[PDB]
């Protein structure tokens, strides 16, 4: 009817995830994996300010810094929708090309 345990993994590119961090597509990267919590921002104890500033990037450095509970880290497993491209993981050989416009 309206229930389906769909488990998959979509490999997204760095330029794709860092361009979806707006409001209803706010994704965070943890352990080089893409986690969807754009509808859990207000459900996160502490606030969304710390999430929006890490949206579209890897915040694993803060995940281990703060120290999440066992159940907490297990909960994130239900918000996994994909992973980062191998080129953006064990390569990083992709031209950025930016900051060429003076909007100051
Ligand atoms: C994006 C995935 C994340 C999930 C699913 C998540 C989930 C949770 C949950 C369930 C708790 C409370 C449970 C407990 O008692 O341990 C928690 C607490 C907390 N989280 Fe996260 N979190 C995430 C990311 C982050 C990130 C990226 C930061 C930092 C920018 C962060 C900072 C905190 C802090 C500070 C607390 C409270 C600990 C304290 O204030 O001493 N979380 N998180």
Query: Which residue from 31, 44, 52 has its CB within 8 A of the most atoms of ligand 1, so it is best to mutate?
Result: 44
100 C-alpha vs ligand 1 centroid, how far in Å?
A: 36
Domain definitions of the chain by residue range: 1-104
Q: Three-class SS of residue 77?
A: helix
Assess contact for 19 and 27: CB atoms under 8 A: no
Structure-determination technique: NMR
- Which residues in 13-102 belong to E strands, given as ranges? 27-30, 33-36, 80-84
> Could you count the other beta carbons within 10 Å of the beta carbon of residue 36?
17
The Cα 64–Cα 61 span in angstroms is 6
Q: What is the CATH number of domain 1-104?
A: 3.10.120.10
Rounded to 10 degrees, what is the CA torsion of 45, 48, 18, 96? -100
Q: What backbone phi and psi angles, to 5 degrees, belong to 49? A: -55, -40
Assess contact for 89 and 29: CB atoms under 8 A: no
Place of tokens 């900051």: 99
Instruction: Give the up-direction half-sphere exposure of residue 24: CA atoms within 13 A in the CB hemisphere.
Output: 0
Rounded to 10 degrees, what is the CA torsion of 90, 18, 9, 66? 80
Angle, CA 75 vertex, CA 55 and CA 41 arms, to 5°: 35
């Amino acid at each position: 009817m309206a229930a389906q345990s769909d488990k998959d993994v979509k490999y997204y590119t760095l330029e794709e995830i860092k361009k979806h961090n707006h409001s209803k597509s706010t994704w965070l990267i943890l352990h080089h994996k893409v986690y969807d919590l754009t509808k859990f921002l207000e459900e996160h104890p502490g606030g969304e300010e710390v999430l929006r500033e890490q949206a579209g990037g890897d915040a694993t450095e803060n995940f281990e810094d703060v120290g999440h509970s066992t159940d907490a880290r297990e909960l994130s497993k239900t918000f996994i929708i994909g992973e980062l491209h191998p080129d953006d993981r064990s390569k990083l050989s992709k031209p950025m090309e930016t900051l060429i416009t003076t909007v100051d």
